[PDB]
Design a binder for this molecule. Structure first.
Ligand SMILES: COc1c(O)cc2oc3cc4c(c(OCc5ccncc5)c3c(=O)c2c1CC=C(C)C)C=CC(C)(C)O4
Ligand SMILES: COc1c(O)cc2oc3cc4c(c(OCc5ccncc5)c3c(=O)c2c1CC=C(C)C)C=CC(C)(C)O4
Ligand SMILES: [Mg+2]
Ligand SMILES: [Mg+2]
Ligand SMILES: [Zn+2]
Ligand SMILES: [Zn+2]
Lengths: 325, 326
């Protein structure tokens, strides 16, 4: 059975990894085993002199701080964004374009980017005068918290996986992770996409294929949009995976609407289990958010994302066909 | 009481640049922030306008004042009172008459009162470099300024402390957003972009048929309030010299104590923090020339000629410090 876990991990470099099976077979440890695998595969353990036991200790503490009773924003979603970023980092149109530290940053950021998520939105936290929104002054409330927790757990006993980075590497990695995770805030999607579009029209490439990014500002924009794409990758996965993501996000939204209802609060979009339209919402979210983003990312890495974009467009067509006339 | 008669006399100056804020601190039993805020709320009729019970106001003010550190030399309750009172004067400038609502006036004054609460006496960069809990909480981004906001709003929830209890929901929400926008703008790492934006507004300035500044939209209104409180924060070099000198004594002591901690730890000592390699006079001239005067000249332009005397004092003080360079 550990034998079967080992076999599914052999797809760690493929879009559409079997992450829910990996979660079941690993004892609800998909984040730990997928991060462990990606580090071994990318050889970051010896590139950055990380004790393997310290890696595992940190990964397990981190995974423990994802909430088991949150339907979508839990450790399976984290493991899925980690493995998804890992794939997008290997696109030929970006090969060896990022340093081993820029690679460590995007993967570490992916792993911590929703840690300790309570399963309600930033707007809910603001409207209920939550401790979180009070702490963070209503600005990227959750995303600041994910960062703070993800970095704070490094200080637990035998958890500092960056202990053998130089102090300048540590400060560079820290800034990059903060910049990336703060960019997962959906209220920053449109600016982030506008920036990605600008970068596509003025794009420059070694005509032989590989992309040419010269200054940090553009390279962090690509890592921000990359982890953002990974965060928004469910509708681009094989349909049986995507449908499971949809079930969970709707269950999580519906529980938030139940909390807004007990409180007499207005019910947020897609959180009213008595007035929902699950399929129309997915088609809508694809049309206005997910496809504009992934179309621009495919232009950026042309044609390396074509097998990702086709799947997204297949999944949009299927969902639309579940809506009667 | 004799001492209260004299405190009340000094508080008659609350509308004047160069109020004796240090005397008021002494005369009020180390309550300059409480007494100056209370005086200003009475002066602007804010307790009636927003139905603020006087006992609630005093209770909040005293709790807020308590959360400034009495053992920090500059970023303490006296600084807070001074910035409140300077903002109060700047709000009353003729070029801004009837521009801002009572709620905006309330926001600017409240932001000024809380804008450094629980300041530990060390810079953002120090808190980042020492991997402090604060910098870890706030991801190295406006670390202190986020903290001042969080503490200032949290204390409103203490027993009989919610001075905004009778605002409407919409009023509370708009006040909260404006205050956040203002206090985050006190982060000195935002100064250059803030001043560059203020320059643009001066260059494209619109006035009304009455000669008063015309502000069409939130973006321009909050930008003026942001720079107003930022000017009040950077107003020490514009005050009468005997006040300015005491502010300089205090910032240097607070900077020197951070430099000792930096030296204890083998860290490079931050600018102006090395008591063995300091040039107090030259640093004040440098700070005026590169930061304070560019700001105050631009603010003076925005409200021309309302602020000419403040600018003249700033330039006199600059010349005085310059004249003392050996
Ligand atoms: C309220 O606006 C909508 C909206 O009307 C519909 C939305 O539908 C979603 C559908 C989703 C998911 C969504 O993402 C939640 C999310 C993602 C990233 N960061 C925060 C929240 C949204 C949405 O986030 C989503 C949003 C985005 C919110 C903003 C402020 C731009 C996640 C997974 C799948 C299965 C694709 O369905
Ligand atoms: C490191 O940069 C310097 C610097 O080299 C010199 C500086 O001199 C100051 C002198 C000061 C004060 C300073 O302000 C500290 C401050 C103010 C507002 N918010 C945060 C810090 C600085 C300074 O803030 C100051 C700074 C920091 C500001 C910027 C633009 C990054 C405060 C009071 C008086 C007496 C006018 O002397
Ligand atoms: Mg998130
Ligand atoms: Mg400050
Ligand atoms: Zn996420
Ligand atoms: Zn200040």
């Amino acid at each position: 059975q550990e034998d079967v876990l080992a076999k599914e991990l052999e797809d760690v470099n493929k879009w559409g990894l079997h992450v829910f099976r990996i979660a079941e077979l690993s004892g609800n440890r998909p984040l730990t085993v997928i991060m462990h695998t990606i580090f071994q595969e990318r050889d970051l353990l010896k590139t950055f002199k990380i004790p393997v036991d310290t890696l595992i200790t940190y990964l397990m503490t981190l995974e423990d701080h994802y909430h088991a009773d949150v339907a979508y924003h839990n450790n399976i979603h984290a493991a899925d964004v980690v493995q998804s970023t890992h794939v997008l980092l290997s696109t030929p149109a970006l090969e060896a374009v990022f340093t081993d530290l820029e690679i460590l940053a995007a993967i570490f950021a992916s792993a911590i980017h929703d840690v300790d998520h309570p399963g309600v939105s930033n707007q809910f936290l603001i409207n209920t005068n939550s401790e979180l929104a009070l702490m963070y002054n209503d600005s990227s409330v959750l995303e600041n918290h994910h960062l703070a927790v993800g970095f704070k757990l490094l200080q637990e006993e035998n958890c500092d996986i960056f202990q053998n980075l130089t102090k300048k590497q540590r400060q560079s990695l820290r800034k990059m992770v903060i910049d990336i995770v703060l960019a997962t805030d959906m209220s920053k999607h449109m600016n982030l996409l506008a920036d990605l579009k600008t970068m596509v029209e003025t794009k420059k490439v070694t005509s032989s294929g590989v992309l040419l990014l010269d200054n940090y500002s553009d390279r962090i924009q690509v890592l921000q949009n990359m982890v953002h794409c990974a965060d928004l990758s469910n509708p681009t996965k094989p349909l049986q995976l995507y449908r499971q993501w949809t079930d969970r996000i709707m269950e999580e939204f519906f529980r938030q609407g139940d909390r807004e209802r007990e409180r007499g609060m207005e019910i947020s979009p897609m959180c009213d289990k008595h007035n929902a339209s699950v399929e129309k919402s997915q088609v809508g979210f694809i049309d206005y958010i997910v496809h504009p983003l992934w179309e621009t990312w495919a232009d950026l890495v042309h044609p390396d994302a074509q097998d990702i974009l086709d799947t997204l467009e297949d999944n949009r067509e299927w969902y639309q066909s579940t809506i009667p006339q």
